[PDB]
Amino acid sequence: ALWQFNGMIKCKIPSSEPLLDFNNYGCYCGLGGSGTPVDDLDRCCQTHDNCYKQAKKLDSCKVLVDNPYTNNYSYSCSNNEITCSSENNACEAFICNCDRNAAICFSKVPYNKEHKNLDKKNC
Amino acid sequence: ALWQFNGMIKCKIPSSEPLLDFNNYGCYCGLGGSGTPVDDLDRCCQTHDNCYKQAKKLDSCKVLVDNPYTNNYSYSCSNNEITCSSENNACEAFICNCDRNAAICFSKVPYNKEHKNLDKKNC
Ligand SMILES: [Ca+2]
Ligand SMILES: [Ca+2]
């Protein structure tokens, strides 16, 4: 879920607007992604893009015809930790977990200014 | 939020369909409520109805023109405890808290079969 992923990263990184700060970073953070991750942040993005690919092959996901970016799930942020809810259907829960791991990855890795708006010439 | 309150009570009482089991119980559990609570469950319902009344007087609530029953907020259920999310606006957070306290109250009090579909002749 885009609105929930944005919220998740803000839970971990309260000073950020994730849709601005983390969009179009490296080869993978943003729409698509190809090539070799340029750093560990971009590698968090590659893992999350693979988590969505895997979510897409799941039998449960084959119904909710809301790409993982508009498929909404339920979670909490409290005390800056994210909890995915037991209320989620199997597809929703799998996606909530991809998002949670990515938000956590993003908070633990360097941010490299020079890889933001990375020109795709060698992704 | 009705859909989230239902979920909250199921978080606390996993064997229930709360919209069936707790609707129209006593004088307060359900649409409105007047009179003296018939037992402690009904009294949980009176406290929750007063929590909604108080939510309604709040300055923040005066905008979201979705009565507290369709005003959606975010929460988690995990390990059978409810967490209201820091992502909630002040109105949403106040309502999430009314709901959470009521769900918890409902799980700690007797259920009296004889007060379900209570005829309103003396509420
Ligand atoms: Ca990507
Ligand atoms: Ca009531």
Q: The domain that contains A37 carries what CATH number?
A: 1.20.90.10
Contacts of A77 in chain B (CB under 8 A): 85-87
CB contact under 8 A, A11 and B86: yes
End-to-end CA distance of chain B: 26
Closest Cβ opposite residue B76 in set A7, A10, A76 = A76
**Token couple for B10:** 């199921």
Residue B115 falls in the annotated catalytic set? no
Count of structural domains, chain B: 1
DSSP string, chain B: -HHHHHHHHHHH-TT--HHHHSSSBTTTBSS---S--SSHHHHHHHHHHHHHHHHHHSTTTTT--S-TTT----EEEETTEEEE-TTS-HHHHHHHHHHHHHHHHHHTS---GGGBT--GGG-
Pick the closest to residue A29 from A50, A9, A43, A16 (CA basis).
Answer: A43
Q: A96 C-alpha vs ligand 1 centroid, how far in Å?
A: 16
- Establish if B91 touches chain A: CB-CB under 8 angstroms: no
The number of CA neighbours under 13 Å toward the Cβ of A59 is 0
> What is the rounded CA–CA span in Å between residue B45 and residue B53?
12
For residue A25, give the DSSP letter.
Answer: B
Give the H or E element holding residue A83.
Answer: strand A81-84
CB atoms within 10 A of CB A45: 24
**Token couple for B34:** 């007047």
Give the H or E element holding residue A118.
Answer: none
> What is the rounded CA–CA span in Å between residue B67 and residue A16?
32
Way it was determined: X-ray
Is A106 within 8 Å of A13 (Cβ atoms)? yes
> What is the rounded CA–CA span in Å between residue B123 and residue B121?
6
> Residue B117's Cα: distance from chain center in Å?
18
Owning domain of residue A29: 1-123
> What is the rounded CA–CA span in Å between residue B39 and residue B43?
6
